Amino acid sequence: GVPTYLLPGSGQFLTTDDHSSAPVLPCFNPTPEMHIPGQVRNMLEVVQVESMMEINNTESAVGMERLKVDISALTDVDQLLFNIPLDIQLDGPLRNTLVGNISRYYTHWSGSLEMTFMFCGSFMATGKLILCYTPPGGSCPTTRETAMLGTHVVWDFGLQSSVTLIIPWISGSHYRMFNNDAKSTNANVGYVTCFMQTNLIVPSESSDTCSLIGFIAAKDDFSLRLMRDSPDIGQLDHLHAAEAAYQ
Amino acid sequence: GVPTYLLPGSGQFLTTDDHSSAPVLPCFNPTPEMHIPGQVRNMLEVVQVESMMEINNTESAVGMERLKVDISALTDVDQLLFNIPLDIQLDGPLRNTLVGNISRYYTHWSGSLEMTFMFCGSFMATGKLILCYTPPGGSCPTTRETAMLGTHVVWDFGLQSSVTLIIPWISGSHYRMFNNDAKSTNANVGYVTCFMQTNLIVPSESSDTCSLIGFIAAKDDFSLRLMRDSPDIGQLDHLHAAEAAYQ
Amino acid sequence: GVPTYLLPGSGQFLTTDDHSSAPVLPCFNPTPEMHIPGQVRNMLEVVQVE
Amino acid sequence: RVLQLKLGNSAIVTQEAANYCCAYGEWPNYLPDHEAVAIDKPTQPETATDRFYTLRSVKWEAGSTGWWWKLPDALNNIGMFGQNVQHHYLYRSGFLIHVQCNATKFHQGALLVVAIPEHQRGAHNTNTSPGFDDIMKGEEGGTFNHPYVLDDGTSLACATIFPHQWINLRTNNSATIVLPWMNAAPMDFPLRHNQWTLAIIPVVPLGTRTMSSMVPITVSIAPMCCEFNGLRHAITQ
Amino acid sequence: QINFYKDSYAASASKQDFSQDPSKFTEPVV
Amino acid sequence: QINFYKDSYAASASKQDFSQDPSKFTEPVV
Amino acid sequence: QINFYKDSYAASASKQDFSQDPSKFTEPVV
Amino acid sequence: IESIIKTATDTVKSEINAELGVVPSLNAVETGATSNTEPEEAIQTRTVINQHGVSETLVENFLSRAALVSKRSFEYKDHTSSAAQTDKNFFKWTINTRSFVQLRRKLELFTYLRFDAEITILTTVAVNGSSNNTYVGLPDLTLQAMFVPTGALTPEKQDSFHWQSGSNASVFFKISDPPARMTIPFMCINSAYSVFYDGFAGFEKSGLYGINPADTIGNLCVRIVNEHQPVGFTVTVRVYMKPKHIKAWAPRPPRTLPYMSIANANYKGKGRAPNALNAIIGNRDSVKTMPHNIVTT
Amino acid sequence: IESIIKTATDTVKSEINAELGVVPSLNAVETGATSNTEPEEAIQTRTVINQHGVSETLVENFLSRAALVSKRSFEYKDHTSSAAQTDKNFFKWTINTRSFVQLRRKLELFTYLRFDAEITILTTVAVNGSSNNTYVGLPDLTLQAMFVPTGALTPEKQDSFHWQSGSNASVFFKISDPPARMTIPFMCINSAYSVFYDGFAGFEKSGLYGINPADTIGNLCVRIVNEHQPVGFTVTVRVYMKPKHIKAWAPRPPRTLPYMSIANANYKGKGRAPNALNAIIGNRDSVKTMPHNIVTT
Q1: Do chains C and H touch by CB distance (3+ pairs < 8 Å)?
Q2: Fewer CB within a 10 Å sphere, N or C end of chain F?
Q3: For residues H45 and H39, what is the distance between their CA atoms, to the nearest angstrom?
Q4: Are D and E close enough to touch, i.e. 3+ CB pairs under 8 angstroms?
């Protein structure tokens, strides 16, 4: 017969292995395929779809109130409205999104993001806003004259309901890393901030307060690697009715 | 199926083995290569670079003082200045060099060496030296008329700062052997010695004493074989903070 | 993978065996050959001497 | 033996050089499109940044252990280079270094001038790592504690494996080194990592019997092929 | 890839289909 | 040399690159 | 003969050299 | 339009724009389409050639990893006096992917799935620690695992004549072997499994909601083949499943609140954020508060 | 200029020289170039044809040998009363190449390295030697080793639901098997690992010097899968690493003084030569004293 010898790793069970294995049911014919709508083949197809940011993550906001930001007319110029942390692995406004949930099964990420905002005031309401992205290095900006030195777009309300801000990929390394430290030079993305460019101006029969909905998605330059167990789910016990499967 | 039988050596773990083994992360893409300066592919590229000899390995010399030899004017002719042992495996002036450190990971060696000396006196200083290599067989020579019968160079101080002495490969066997015995016919290389050929002569405003720096390297005929653990490093305990990797 | 079975004689050590076996020192270069007088290749060459 | 260097609005001449060194045989260049990562159009200032800056001089004395400076940290507050560094998240450049020291035909002494990539320092006789103020000296630089072991437990005797030159007072009065970009990444954040350390070590000490005089050592550095990405508001050390 | 079983479902995993169409999710409009 | 794994990083060591250039360390001068 | 090791000294024994010259021992004369 | 994509997309150089009637940063979210604004239209860009691969996010790679689906412990001993609820040297399990949450949440990202299932069985043993017992060494037992279709007859005892396995598939394995392994084909009466099912299983109104017996793979029946020894042991069996040859349709919102039961989708949430019924994300003091703000000193 | 070199260089025959303006033995060290004087220029030589190979000093051969990186011992028993610092039938380790000095000194010859890592795990066991215990034989236990990324969640106890391994890679192996083995790819976010790092890991000034989390391979989590027996054992696990597919840049001066810590490059030296802070080489009586001088009789 053939002379042979056994290597280190013989008989081990590795959960990421890929081999053929013995069929239980010989000569079995599986059911024919038919066309079904909406087939998916790479998870990067799902990550390109817009989903809502939870920007209003505050103690007083309950349920659906957390998915919108309310804005109103101001007596003073150049004022800050809100800001968003961009750390897409950590708990925060971006986490419960299609891009956030899928990314938390992986450890490294790369590529550009888009934020889109929709205005939901009356037809008679008017205003202008400035949306800014600041690259990392120090504290989040608190004044319009500091923030406007970064990447930004100035938005006019009108017949088109919505505006997109691109967050471009700006990094020293090819990938950023989902290490458990928000202040690491391998992890921090910088900040998004929003200011009044003019004022929210409305007539007496419109509501005095109007709402923004914010959305996020990845562009097609996006990439993910090094898969892991997701931290978004867990158990300390067997579920209800799990014993009945043995009885 | 295939008839087989197991050989002696089945299931052993040998630390110098070379086999394929199961990938932990399937479909993983490693980061692209980019150009980086100073790539190295054979350790014999490093061994060809000059580095300083510790010739002044004496009880009174502290730190950087050990890396130079001081010379001064003499009242008597033909005098000895210094000598160097050539046993490149043993502790001595050659050990803490690029050629000495890399060679101490191996057990057999072959090929030619070069010693280069640089004069560091004033511009107004003058002199001539004789540098000799003596093949093995008996005691190190102590007089110029004995040493000049060996391989030698006579050096004149001038606009060129430095001189090279070649130590040619002269051996009965193809390799010399790093056995733990300095007096073995398979190990001993012979001796290097330095004498006054004239005298060190300087004017009243120059310093009365001048310094030599000595350097060593291998030529491109050099070779090494039979790798081993280096004797230049060791431990009796775990290092500080080594336990914190488990906590 | 490949379906296999073990024969009688698996794992035995026989002192007259002839197989390849793992090299201890990878990439090692042995010393060059040179001519030496009086090489012998069969013991019947020695047995023919008085 | 004779050399002229010309960059931007600045020029240096020397009558007693000894060739010059290119680290690992390379020359500085801009980042090509097949190695790039950040997608924004880069700032490339040319003659505003790529010119000689001269640091404070230091005195060579009989007890001197030697001196060091870290790059880019030593330049992060100087001229239009410092302004671009403070307004951008990312930087890249090479460097050209010129070291100057002269004395009479009756003086003797020798300096090793060496550029060390990733010179991570150690502390002496303790388990605690060096602090921020031990490392980040800026334009003043620092001094060696134990130059015989390069302040890292290796050795001075083998330091000739790095890009280097000597100043030997009977032979030459200046040293020159050209440094490429030297990092694992194509660009970096200039306020927290240093690519190169310049070190100057007196292996043979200064000596004479003529009239005493103060003998200074002077360092001039020019950035080459500067690029900056990720424009924002100004941030300092 | 090694397979000596008769039934085709016994084989190793298949990791070579790089075909995509994001537009059925991102642009489902006439 | 035997390799039945799909990922190329699973392979045995590579010991056939004999290319050298000592001059980048021994002669770094113009 | 089976050998998958890289170093040639790892191989099995060699038993095919039938060349002889007894005369260097039996007839060493001019 | 369908195309082959092996790497992330390149970026192209771009110039100043000032053009009437053109507004690439404005969009109409009400249509249901995602924004088509490109980086070259939003900012000035350089050229970049992109070499990042996309293979680790393929659906076969994302789902095809072996995961724990069952864990059962029982006493190997003389059971002559044991109560009727006991696993008397054997057990039965109805195969499901709902009992352990990491596999459940990944499969529930899709509405329909088609795959073959590779099954691996791992066994361990220990001596029972009663005060009459020393340690004594561990036996190399033989186990039998028999595959039985949904609702068919199963053995009533360790030595039943039902274990003769005349047409059912059985696997016999020892504790000293590598783990036992086999592949079960895609067995559904439909072209795919339903991961979710908005209906009732029968013609009368009293049936179970959300359960569809066509998606149940079957039963696994497991025994020790040896007779009992003079002393008791505890035996633990673990079952692992790896999906392969996968197709997937209609992706879904991920689960956010903890699971309650294997039978249904019922919910309760944590008592406070994160993952509470009224608040999924953890709180901050205001919409102007930056939670990990860098401090300069 | 780059070329292929498989053997050491030949030597050529040479004659008398006496020529004005030519001085091949004189050199200019101040330039930073190494001496270019050849043996044929220094002495009269014969022709020699050189057959010595150079392959044992290739960088792949110099670094690609399996070396010890971790060694941990723990008690396998009932841990119900044990203090909180104990390894209670499991442990966690953060993968590093700094704890054992022979591998550390070899890797520290270079500034940057790129390699894949082949990991081998070796296990041994012994009976606890308390005065109540005889010897009793040794069990054939099953172990699980799980790979977890840097900073991710790790199991809190031997029977945690975290061991279900739904997307993490796990390997299961027995003490009676050959050693367990697998390959981890080159995983850095950069094109090479940094062996030395002259910087700080974060945007604030209070971070660690000389540590760069991008170079950390990950965590290894290890448990015994069996429940505890009636008697205690001591289990020891050893981990070995072999680099392969290696590239290396910018060679460095070797370490001379002893190592103090895994965290940094700190130093102290021996109390007397060799390897003292003031003296690396052992002393001799004078620069004229020959230390192993041959005596003739």
Answers
A1: no
A2: N
A3: 8
A4: no
